[PDB]
Amino acid sequence: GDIQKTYKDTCELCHGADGKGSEAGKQFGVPDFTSPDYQKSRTDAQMKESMTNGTKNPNYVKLSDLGVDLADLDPLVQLVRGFNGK
Ligand code: HEC
Numbered sequence: 001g002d003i004q005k006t007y008k009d010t011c012e013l014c015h016g017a018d019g020k021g022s023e024a025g026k027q028f029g030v031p032d033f034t035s036p037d038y039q040k041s042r043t044d045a046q047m048k049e050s051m052t053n054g055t056k057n058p059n060y061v062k063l064s065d066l067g068v069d070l071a072d073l074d075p076l077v078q079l080v081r082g083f084n085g086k
Pocket of ligand 1: 007025058066
């Protein structure tokens with residue numbers, strides 16, 4: 001549905017259809033969302049902080065700069081969690 005469409009349209013280019021990082025995402029330095037070790041290293045609040053505020057890393061565009069509806073943040077975090085263990 002709508003959240004999966006948003007992921008396909010403005011996240012998958014970097015994060016990949018499998019969450020592991022496309023060739024582009026690996027060039028930019030995405031994490032591996034399928035890694036259980038990566039997943040458990042971040043709380044949901046920490047993910048949301050990065051997505052809302054940006055990080056120290058100049059390669060990461062905060063999601064409001066991508067134009068993403070702020071109401072999509074929580075479901076996008078849940079979608080990212082969905083890659084865990086795949
Ligand atoms: C390339 C241009 C990207 C697009 C489009 C999106 N993301 Fe991304 N993301 C990217 C990088 C290079 C990184 C790591 C380095 C950094 O920029 O900070 C990330 C990181 C994330 C994370 C992890 C945050 C954490 O605290 O561990 C999440 C949860 C994330 N990205 C989600 C995400 C979503 C939902 C996107 C579409 C709306 C999206 N990203 C786009 C690179 C790129």
